[PDB]
Each structure stands twice: as structure tokens, then as C-alpha cells.
Amino acid sequence: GMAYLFVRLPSSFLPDEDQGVFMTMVQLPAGATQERTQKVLNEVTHYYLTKEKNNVESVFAVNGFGFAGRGQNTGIAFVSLKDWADRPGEENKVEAITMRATRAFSQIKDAMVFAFNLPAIVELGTATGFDFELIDQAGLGHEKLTQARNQLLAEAAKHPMLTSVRPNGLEDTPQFKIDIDQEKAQALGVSINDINTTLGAAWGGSYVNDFIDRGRVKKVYVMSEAKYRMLPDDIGDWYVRAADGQMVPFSAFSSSRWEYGSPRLERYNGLPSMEILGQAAPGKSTGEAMELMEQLASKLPTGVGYDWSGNQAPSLYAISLIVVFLCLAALYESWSIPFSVMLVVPLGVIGALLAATFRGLTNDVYFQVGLLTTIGLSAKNAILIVEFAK
Amino acid sequence: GAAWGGSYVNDFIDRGRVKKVYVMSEAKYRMLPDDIGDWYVRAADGQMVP
Amino acid sequence: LKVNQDGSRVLLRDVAKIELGGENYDIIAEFNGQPASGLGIKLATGANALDTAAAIRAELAKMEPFFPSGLKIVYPYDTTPFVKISIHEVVKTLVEAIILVFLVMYLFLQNFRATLIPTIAVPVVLLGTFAVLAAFGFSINTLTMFGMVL
Amino acid sequence: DTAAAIRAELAKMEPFFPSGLKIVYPYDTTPFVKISIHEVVKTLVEAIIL
Amino acid sequence: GADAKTVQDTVTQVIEQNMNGIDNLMYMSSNSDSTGTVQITLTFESGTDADIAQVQVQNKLQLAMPLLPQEVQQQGVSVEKSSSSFLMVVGVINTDGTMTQEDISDYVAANMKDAISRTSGVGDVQLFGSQYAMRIWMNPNELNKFQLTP
Amino acid sequence: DIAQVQVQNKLQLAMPLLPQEVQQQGVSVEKSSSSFLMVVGVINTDGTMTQEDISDYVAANMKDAISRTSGVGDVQLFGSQYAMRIWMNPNELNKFQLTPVDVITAIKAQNAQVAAGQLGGTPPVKGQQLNASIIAQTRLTSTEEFGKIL
Amino acid sequence: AVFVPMAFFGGSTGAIYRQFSITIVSAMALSVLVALILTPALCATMLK
Amino acid sequence: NAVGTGVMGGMVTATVLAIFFVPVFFVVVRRRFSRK
Numbered sequence A: 001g002m003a004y005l006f007v008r009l010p011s012s013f014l015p016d017e018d019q020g021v022f023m024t025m026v027q028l029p030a031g032a033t034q035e036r037t038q039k040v041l042n043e044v045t046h047y048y049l050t051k052e053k054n055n056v057e058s059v060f061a062v063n064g065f066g067f068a069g070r071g072q073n074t075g076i077a078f079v080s081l082k083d084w085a086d087r088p089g090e091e092n093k094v095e096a097i098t099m100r101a102t103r104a105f106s107q108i109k110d111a112m113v114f115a116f117n118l119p120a121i122v123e124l125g126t127a128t129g130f131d132f133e134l135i136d137q138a139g140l141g142h143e144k145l146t147q148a149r150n151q152l153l154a155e156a157a158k159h160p161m162l163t164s165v166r167p168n169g170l171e172d173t174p175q176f177k178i179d180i181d182q183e184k185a186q187a188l189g190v191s192i193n194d195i196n197t198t199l200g201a202a203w204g205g206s207y208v209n210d211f212i213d214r215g216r217v218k219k220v221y222v223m224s225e226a227k228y229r230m231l232p233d234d235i236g237d238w239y240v241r242a243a244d245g246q247m248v249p250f251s252a253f254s255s256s257r258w259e260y261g262s263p264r265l266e267r268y269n270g271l272p273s274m275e276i277l278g279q280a281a282p283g284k285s286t287g288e289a290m291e292l293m294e295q296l297a298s299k300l301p302t303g304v305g306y307d308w309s310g311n312q313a314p315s316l317y318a319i320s321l322i323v324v325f326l327c328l329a330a331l332y333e334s335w336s337i338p339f340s341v342m343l344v345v346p347l348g349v350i351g352a353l354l355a356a357t358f359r360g361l362t363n364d365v366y367f368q369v370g371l372l373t374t375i376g377l378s379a380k381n382a383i384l385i386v387e388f389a390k
Numbered sequence B: 001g002a003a004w005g006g007s008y009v010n011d012f013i014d015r016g017r018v019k020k021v022y023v024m025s026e027a028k029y030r031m032l033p034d035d036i037g038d039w040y041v042r043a044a045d046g047q048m049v050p
Numbered sequence C: 001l002k003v004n005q006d007g008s009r010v011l012l013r014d015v016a017k018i019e020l021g022g023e024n025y026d027i028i029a030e031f032n033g034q035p036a037s038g039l040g041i042k043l044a045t046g047a048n049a050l051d052t053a054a055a056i057r058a059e060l061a062k063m064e065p066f067f068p069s070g071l072k073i074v075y076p077y078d079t080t081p082f083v084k085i086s087i088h089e090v091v092k093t094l095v096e097a098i099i100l101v102f103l104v105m106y107l108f109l110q111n112f113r114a115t116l117i118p119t120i121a122v123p124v125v126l127l128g129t130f131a132v133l134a135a136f137g138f139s140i141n142t143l144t145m146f147g148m149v150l
Numbered sequence D: 001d002t003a004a005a006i007r008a009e010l011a012k013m014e015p016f017f018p019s020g021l022k023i024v025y026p027y028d029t030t031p032f033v034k035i036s037i038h039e040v041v042k043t044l045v046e047a048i049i050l
Numbered sequence E: 001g002a003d004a005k006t007v008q009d010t011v012t013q014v015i016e017q018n019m020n021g022i023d024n025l026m027y028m029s030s031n032s033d034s035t036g037t038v039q040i041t042l043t044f045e046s047g048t049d050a051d052i053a054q055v056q057v058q059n060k061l062q063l064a065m066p067l068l069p070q071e072v073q074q075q076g077v078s079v080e081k082s083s084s085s086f087l088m089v090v091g092v093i094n095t096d097g098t099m100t101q102e103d104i105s106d107y108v109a110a111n112m113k114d115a116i117s118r119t120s121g122v123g124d125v126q127l128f129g130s131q132y133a134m135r136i137w138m139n140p141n142e143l144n145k146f147q148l149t150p
Numbered sequence F: 001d002i003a004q005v006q007v008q009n010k011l012q013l014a015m016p017l018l019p020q021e022v023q024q025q026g027v028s029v030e031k032s033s034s035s036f037l038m039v040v041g042v043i044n045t046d047g048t049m050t051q052e053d054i055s056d057y058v059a060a061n062m063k064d065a066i067s068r069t070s071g072v073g074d075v076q077l078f079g080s081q082y083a084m085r086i087w088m089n090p091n092e093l094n095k096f097q098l099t100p101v102d103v104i105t106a107i108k109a110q111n112a113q114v115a116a117g118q119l120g121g122t123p124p125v126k127g128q129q130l131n132a133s134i135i136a137q138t139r140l141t142s143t144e145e146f147g148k149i150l
Numbered sequence G: 001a002v003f004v005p006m007a008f009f010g011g012s013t014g015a016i017y018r019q020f021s022i023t024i025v026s027a028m029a030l031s032v033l034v035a036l037i038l039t040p041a042l043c044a045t046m047l048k
Numbered sequence H: 001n002a003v004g005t006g007v008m009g010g011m012v013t014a015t016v017l018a019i020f021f022v023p024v025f026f027v028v029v030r031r032r033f034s035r036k
């Protein structure tokens, strides 16, 4: 029994617990603005302020800063839960708070918002979960690599004893490409220097110089009122001076056309890569899923490689078997006492398993050492049953 | 300097990895000292000079 | 910028609007749906954690007094009081595990003197572990505190 | 250990080589380490047996 | 200004080539954003000194420093200690003498922020808004009717 | 470890006292060991390529990683990495009336990447529905395109 | 003989299983030394 | 709860089993004596 009470008991690392403090991020579709995402951040903030007064003490919204990266797509609001005395029930604890919260954001919305117990753990080591990555080893482009990732994410979900796999954050939004015909430019009499710092110092921003403000030196930027750089028709508003002391429209030398680029290009180890955050199956666990994912990445096109309790214990406990017998003979020389104690091990451990298999515990770090201590007392007890009787 | 020796002008992209762009001259116009006169520089008054 | 033919002075204000504005309008914070800014301190790979955050207030303690009208501080997402509580609930267990041992000691040893030796044995053994793990490098971590208790 | 990891990093460039591109090893320290250990540990056992 | 492709191979790649010859290291990674913002991460072996390991990465970056756009050079190049996780995130609001989510972001970043990042081994401070800057908003029609450029 | 830092954080005070040709060139500070160990030859047999084609592919796939990997002081490269090489004919410059200064300037103008801003700017107008990055000039790709510089 | 051999930690499970045993392994030697010096002394001195 | 649930189980079952019933007696019997 003991064995089956242990192999079947699932293995975690360290238990995620209430911290009086959690958070939840936002993610809008391709090329959303600051005004669109701000509408969502309001709805998020108020599920916490009106439908969670008893629980929430104070929110702290932020618009344009996710933990993917940045941009007018992203967002996040930091929560600060009222202290634990005023929060009595299991429903008044973050397991249940992020349950009906995440439910609310998948219900009455048209974007993507989650919520999570801050991994008390460390960022890494979720257990039954992985972080895959897809390298372009050969001279393929970002567009060809993308297609291999669409075939990887497809094939895992095509036959998942499953898995749950998704990309990390390469939404792939369009971009307003402006081709400057170089021949045209110089015929009208303009320097390409001046043309580049028109489009650069108007639409984007340009660090010109520093000035003094109330003691502390700050910066001086130059751009343009919002309304002259909102849409692609406003490009023609800007007239540049030409050699022959007279203005020239952008449209003259300009060419307007859209394209499909990506707003964030990851690069793992000197080469372009794309992150693939997938988890272990609801049945399987890591070593299974991981090695059942290396065979799927090796079935992709050429020029596309990859790169990613503990195996710990197996060997650790091995020395726990060796040092015991010797210490069970440094005061107990015979080869009779060194096999007595050797049975109290699973005498007690069967129950340690049993108490944690019965309630909602797991094989985490505190339990794995709850075993070692259970054995140290098992030795004690038995060694008195021996030392005295010998 | 940019004929006989070499000059780091700018960087370009080649198959993903950014490399360099150099400028010089075919070997045969910089092998002996008589080939110095081959190079004519522009002068202020829009005309060449040996 | 220029002086056109008829000595008409073109200034920087005539061609453009000039206000003292933010350097970066990409992000905007609203504490409980009300406008505000703050400071989100991040740790330094190997920093002292609870001592860094204790000194976040120490340095911040002397900016407080020279604030103008209305400018006040407020605390969301804060680690501090979880440290405070895990110590307090473990040290609570410590004393409970003593007191409870003292009753089992009296139930078997009706001698009062006898329920006193083991009661006054392990108090010392715990302190030595603070003196030993301090000498080896460890802290009062979440881990080493359950190590006292276990 | 550096030279053992010269192969380790180099082990994953191997497979994506185009037609004809193959590796070869001149001037290499490795097998002298391999042999001096093997001839000394050989002496060790000889000195026991004897 | 720079888009995702510009930063990808004018700042990103330039460093990644000149980011070698360093002790203790399993991998590097990168994120080159469309806001014109790249940031590389090098993870080292467990127990390696973060004190020396910083120096090595940042005294090798600074060989590729003059291989970078001059816009980027005068911009903030930083090498710090990572810890993807905040702890103290001190909100700072107004109640009486009302000011905007921009006025506070400046005063916070012109009184307190400078000190915090320094103080007690703070890896790097985050600022929720931005410090003030003499902002100008060039009207294009007003530049044309006098005959001018940015 | 420390001795390197000291030499290279003192060199970099004389860094701006150097020719600009040298600054954009490779300044390096490394660990010496006048003695190779592994010198991995890399040849071709089937799909024949020259002693130049291989020197590039070696230095654009493996070299970057090796120098980094397991405390490699500095890597030697037996050949050179590729580079858009140009061979200015002097007679052909004279018969149109030109110099290498006009060739160099034409590459530092047409062959570059530019930081154009974005639609739906950092501070937009309230109610905009789009936000996408503008593209400008691109760093050139192939020989063909460097042949068509005006 | 079961604590310190398992206190040979590894990876991100470093101080994790390490501090695990040692803390209490330290507490074993301190409980032994007390059970060899103090607990004896006191027990003799004054038990009944 | 993660610590104590793991030990409580062990202890209940270590002692009430060892001291009585199963090995911790039954051992030295067939280990010391049995055959040698």
C-alpha cells in the first residue's frame, strides 16, 4: 500500500498561499490605444471596489505596462487586500478571490484579463509546467520562423494525456511603411538628412538638449500636437524646405502602404526565437510532456531547432541509506541492529502519506522533510527498543 | 585613407546578422607608388586635380 | 527662429505650443480611480529584502515633511506585513509546543520539578541553532523557522 | 572543463550545417589529459599488485 | 521613435555580438519592442556573485557603446540587478491642493526617486508616470506659412 | 576577475582621447594565455565553398557562442566574417568627376535605419482607435541593392 | 544519517532541502550536547 | 498545515505500530537470532 500511497500522490514544489496582496493584467487586441485599454482598467478596478468591499482595501491601476512588456495594448492593477482578520472565510481568501474575479473577466468583456496568487515560490518551477523556446538556427527570417511555430502549436493541439500550449506575446500587428523614392527627393532639391529628422522629430520625439527647472536639470523634447500625427493622411501636412528656398509636400517624394511586421521580436542566445509557454497535461507531468514536445519540434522544417520533488531525491536518499547503516553500527556493531531500525522507516511513513493523501495536501517541500523527520523519530523509538534490550 | 587602406563606413544586414560595410579599391590601383597619380580629387572649382 | 523681410519676429511660441509636460505619456496611474504617481521598487539580485524595504521608509522618512499642500503617502502591494506575520505565527507555535509539552510532562511526571528539566532543555537548544546558522550564513528564513518548529 | 564545453556548445551547431560542411581536429590538448591519467592510474594498480 | 525592427539590429544585435567572454553563464535572451526599447537578460550559475557578474556584462557592452545610434547613447543605457517582482510599491496621491497624474509623477521623480534607487541596495526603481521636461508641440501649418522645418 | 576591471575602467577614461576610427573599431579587454588548446578545423568536401565562405559561416553561427561559453578568454578566427566589400575604380570616378568622399557619404544616407515615430502617439487625442509604428529607411540586404545607390 | 545526506541539495532546490536538514541537524547536535551536559547536570542536581 | 499534516500522519503511524504490533521487536527476533 505505502508504495501506491506515494507514487499516485502528486508532486508539487512549494504551496501557493494567501499573501494579502495579488494582481491582474490586461491585454488588448492588435494595435489598441490608451483610451480603449483605459476603459477596461476601470471595469477591473470596480469589480474590486463595488463587488469586493469586504475583501479589498485599495487598488492601484496602471495603463500601458503589462508584465509581457509595455505599450497601449497592455495593462495591470495592483490589489491590496484588507487584513486577514477582516477576511475570515475561504471565499475571503485569494484562492477564491481570483476565482470569481477571473470568471468575471471572461464573462462581461471582449479582451483578456486574468488574476493570480503571486507565486510565493520563485518565478520558475511551477511543476507540471514548462518554458519551451523555438530557435531559428539557419538563415530563415522572422516570417518563416513564425510559420514553424504555428505548426508546432497546431500539432500539439491537433493530437494532445493532453497539454495546454500557447504563444508568449508576438500579437503581430501591422505597420505604416513609408518608402522614400531617393531620386525624386534630390530632383526637387531636398537633403535626406532634413527629411529624416522631420518624420523623426515630429511623429516620434527627439532629445534635443537639457534645460534647468527649479534646480534639477531635466530634458527638452520636440514633437507636434497630437492632431497632426494621428492618421496616415496627416503625413502630407508636413512641408520640408528644399535647397531652392521653397516648400515641398511629403506626398511628392512619399509612398504610402501598410505591411505585416511584429511589434516585439524575441532573440534567444544570439539568434531570433519565439517563446512557447505550455503546461503539462492534466494527467501527465513535465518529464512526460517535455519529451513529448521535443519529438514535435524535431518534426518541423529545416533550420528550426529548440532549447528549454526533483531528480534530486533519488540520489539524496541513496546516501540516506548508506550513512544510516554505518551509524547503525558505529554504536551497534553486529549486522543484527543495522537491519532492525531498517523497518521503522515505512512503519511511520505509511501514515505520513495517509494524512496528506486524505486531506488536500501534496508531495511538496515541507512534506518531503516531514518524511525525514518522521524517520528520525522512527530511528529513535526503535534504537531504544534495541540499545536497551541489547 | 579610404582607397589604399580601408574605411569603416556603416553597418548593413546580411541574413539576419548585422555585419560591416567597407570601401577601398580594386587591388590593381594600389600596388605600386606610380598608382598614386590615378586618383583625382575634386577641387572647390568643380574640376579634377591629380 | 526667423525674422521675415519686414522685420516681423517669428518666435518659437508662434509656430508651436509650449507647456511643461511629461517626458513620457505612455503610462498613467490611478490609485482607486483617482489620479496619482508612485514608486515600484525592485530588489537587487542578492539584496537583504526585509532590510532594503525597512530602509525604503528610512530614506523616504525625510522627504515626508517638505511635501506641499495635499501630497500624502499610501501603501498598496506591500511585502512587509507578511514577514511580520509569518514570524509571529511561528513564534506562536514555538510557545504552544512548549506549554503543550509541559502538560504531557506533568501528566506522566507528577513531580513539578520533573516537568521543568525538558521544559528548560530545548529553550537553549533552539537559541544555539540561531547561533549556529548565523555562523554558517543562514537567516531567519521561512525555511529555518519551520526548522526550529519541526 | 572549458574544452569539454567547447564541444558541448559546438554540439548543437553540427546538425544545421549545409552540404559538405564537416568538422576536423588538429592541435588538440584533450587526449593528453586522457592519457596521463590513464598511465598514472595504470601505475597505481601495478604498484598494488607488485 | 524606433520600431521593433529598427532596435532589433541597431542596438539589440550590436550588443549580442559584443556580449561574450564572460565567466559563469547558461544563456542570454532579449526583447526588442516597437516602442523603441530593448533589454537583454543574462542568467548565471546559482551561487555566482552578482557583484562581479554585473561588471563583466557591462564592461563589454561598453565596447559596443560607440557602435550604437547617437540617439541611444544620450539615452539611458543601464546595467542592474534583476528581480522580476516588486515588494514596496509606495503610492503617492493628492487630496487638498489638487494636482494631476503628471504633476505628482514629476515631484516624486524630483525629490524621492533619485534617493531610493541609491539607498539600501535597490536594484532599480520604477517610476509610474514621468519626470517633467520642456515639451514642445510643433504645428506643421504654422511652420509652412513662414517657410520652416523641425 | 578584479584585475581585468581595473585595467579596463581606466582605459575607458582615455577612450574619448582616441581616433574615431579606433572607437568604432574593436577595443577589447580579456584574459591572456599565450597558448591554444582546442583549434577546431572546419572544412568542406561535397558542396564546395572557398576559404572565405567558411570563415564567414563559422563566424556567423559558432564563434559568437564559443567565446561566451565556459570561460573562453578570447576566440581566434582563421579568416574573416563577411562584409559588404566595395572596390572603387579611380578612372571611373574621374570620368564622371567624383571622389571616395562622395561614395562614403552616399552609403551614410541611403544605407541606414531611421527612427520614425508612430500613429496614435505617446500622448494622443482622447478617442483614437489605432496605434501602429511607422517604418522608415532600412539597412540594405544584398549586393544588388548596394549596386543601385545614387 | 538521513538528514545531512539529503541536505546535499541541488539546483533551485538549493537552500530549500539544505537549510531543511542542517537547521534541525544543528538542532540534533545541540540537543545531544544538551542531553550530554545540561539535561544530565540538571537531572542529577535536581530531579526528585 | 503543509508541515504538520505530513508529520502527524507519520507519528500516529510510527509509534502506534512500532512500540506495539509491527516490527520494533519482531525485528531483533528474526535479525539477531533467526539464523545467526
Ligand SMILES: O=C(O)c1cn(C2CC2)c2cc(N3CCNCC3)c(F)cc2c1=O
Residues within 6 Å of the ligand: C135
Ligand atoms: O562569532 C562569530 O563567528 C562572528 C561574530 N561576529 C560578531 C562580532 C561578534 C561577527 C560580526 C561580523 N560583522 C559585525 C558587523 N560589521 C561587519 C562584521 C561578521 F561579519 C562576522 C562575525 C562572526 O563571524
